[PDB]
Amino acid sequence: SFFSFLGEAFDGARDMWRAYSDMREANYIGSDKYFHARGNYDAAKRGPGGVWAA
Amino acid sequence: SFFSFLGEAFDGARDMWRAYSDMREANYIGSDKYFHARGNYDAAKRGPGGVWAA
Amino acid sequence: SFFSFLGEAFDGARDMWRAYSDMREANYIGSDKYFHARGNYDAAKRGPGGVWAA
Amino acid sequence: SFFSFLGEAFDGARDMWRAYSDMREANYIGSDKYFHARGNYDAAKRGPGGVWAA
Amino acid sequence: SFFSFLGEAFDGARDMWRAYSDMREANYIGSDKYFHARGNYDAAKRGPGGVWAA
Amino acid sequence: SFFSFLGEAFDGARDMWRAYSDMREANYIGSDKYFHARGNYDAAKRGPGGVWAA
Amino acid sequence: SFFSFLGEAFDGARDMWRAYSDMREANYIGSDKYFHARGNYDAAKRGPGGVWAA
Amino acid sequence: SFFSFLGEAFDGARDMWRAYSDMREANYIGSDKYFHARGNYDAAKRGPGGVWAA
Amino acid sequence: SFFSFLGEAFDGARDMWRAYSDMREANYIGSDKYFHARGNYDAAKRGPGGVWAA
Amino acid sequence: SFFSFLGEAFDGARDMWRAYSDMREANYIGSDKYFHARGNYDAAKRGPGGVWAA
Amino acid sequence: SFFSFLGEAFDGARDMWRAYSDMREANYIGSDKYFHARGNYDAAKRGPGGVWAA
Amino acid sequence: SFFSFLGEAFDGARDMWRAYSDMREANYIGSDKYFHARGNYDAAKRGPGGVWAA
């Protein structure tokens, strides 16, 4: 389960539940980057992202 | 489950549930990048993305 | 479970639950970066991200 | 379990539960960075992130 | 369990539970950085992060 | 267990539980930094982080 | 990569590479079994399986 | 990478590489079993498995 | 990396590399079993497994 | 890295490298078993496993 | 790193490296068993395991 | 690092390196067993294990 909200038989109010997270490059199992690396050049660009709510 | 909202028999109010996340490049199992790499050039560009709500 | 909210048979109020986190590059099992590395150049850029709520 | 809120049969009030954390690069098991490294250059940039709630 | 709140059969009040932490680069088991290192240059930049709630 | 709150059959009041901590780079088992190091340069920058609640 | 064999420019011999494993119910990320469970009965049967080479 | 064999420019001999493991129910991140459990009955049966090489 | 063998420019001999392990139920991060448990019955059966090489 | 063998530019001989281990239920971070437990019955059976090489 | 062998530019001989260990239930950080326990019954059985090499 | 062997530019001989250990239930940080316990019954059985090399 990732960010699953389960509500039952309730009386909700305003702004009641908030789950905010930044999980970039998290939760790796056996996942290698440049494991046997020689003479490499890494200049990859990644622009803005995520959630921008106003 | 990813971002599944389940509500039953309730009285909701304004702005009640929010689940915001940035999960870029997360949750890898056995997934390799440049595992046996020699003399490579990485300059891939990725522009803006995500959710922009105003 | 990651950020799962479970409520049952309650009377909620305003701003009641908040779960905020920054989990970037967390929770690694057996995940190597530059394990056997020689003469490499790492200048990857990553822009802004996460959750920006106003 | 990461940031899972479970409430049952209660009367909630305002701002009742808060769980805030900065878990960047935490919780590693057997995860190596630059284990056998020689003559490497690390200048990777990472911009702002996390949770910004106002 | 990380930051899991479990409440049952209660009468909550305002600002009742708070769990704040800074866990950056914590909880390592067998996780090496620059274990056999010679002539390396580490100038990686990491911007602001964490939880900023106002 | 890290920062897990368990309450049952109670009458809560305001500001009742607080658990604040700074656990940066804590709790290491067999985790080495620069174990066999010669002629290295460490100038990695890490910006502000943690929990900022106002 | 799972069980990928890559050989190049070699002189192989008999029984040269063997990779045997039992990975049943391994490598879970955020995957819950009976998370909020009450009064359940689990008697599922699973017969023999795996690799039987003679 | 899980059980990946990479050989290059070599002269192999008999029975040269062996990687045997029993990884059942290993490598869990945020994966809960019977997290909030009450009055459950678990009698699931699982037969023989794995690798049987003769 | 889990059980990854990397050889390059060598002269191998018989029975040269062996990596044997029993990793059952190892390497857990934030993974709970029977966290808030009351009156449960656990009698799950698991048969033989692993690697049996003759 | 778990049980990763890296050899380069060598002359191997017989039975040269051996890495044997029993890592059952090892390496836990924040992983709870029966944390808040009352009146439970644990009689789960697990058969033989591991590596059996003859 | 767990049981990682790194050799470079050498002349190996017979039975040269051995790393044997029994690490069952080792290396725990914040991992609780029966933390708040009352009236529980623990009779879980675990059969033989580990490495058996002949 | 756990049981990591690093050799470079050498002339090895027979039976050269041995690292044998019994690390069962070692290396605990903040890890409690039966912390607040009342009227419990512990009769869990664990069979043979470890490394058996002949």
Numbering used by the authors:
A (entry chain D), B (entry chain B), C (entry chain F), D (entry chain H), E (entry chain J), F (entry chain L), ...: 2 to 55
Cite, word for word, the article reporting this structure.
The disease arises in mice and humans from the misfolding of the acute phase protein serum amyloid A1 (SAA1). To investigate the molecular basis of the systemic AA amyloidosis, we here use electron cryo-microscopy (cryo-EM) and determined the structures of AA amyloid fibrils from a patient and from a diseased mouse. The human fibril encloses a clearly discernible cavity that contains many charged and polar amino acid residues, making it likely that the vacant space in the cavity is filled with water. Both fibril proteins adopt all-beta folds and differ sharply from the known globular conformations of SAA family members. The murine and the human fibril possess in-register, parallel cross-β sheets and adopt highly similar β-arch conformations at the protein N-termini.
The human fibril proteins originate from human hSAA1.1 and mainly represent the fragments hSAA1.1(2–64) and hSAA1.1(2–47). The ordered part of the density of the mouse fibril corresponds to residues 1–69 of mSAA1.1, the ordered part of the human fibril to hSAA1.1 residues 2–55. The dominant human morphology is 8.1 ± 0.5 nm wide and possesses a cross-over distance of 55.2 ± 1.7 nm (measurements were obtained from cryo-EM images). By contrast, platinum side shadowing demonstrates that the human fibril is right-hand twisted and contains right-hand twisted β-sheets. The human fibril protein contains no amyloid key fold. The human fibril exhibits a considerably larger interface containing polar, ionic, and hydrophobic cross-stack interactions. The center of the human fibril is formed by a steric zipper, which shows a self-complementary packing of the sheets β3 from the two protein stacks. Our reconstruction shows that the N-terminus of the human protein, which lacks the N-terminal Arg, is located within the tightly packed fibril core. The N-terminal α-amino groups form salt bridges to the β-carboxyl groups of Asp33.
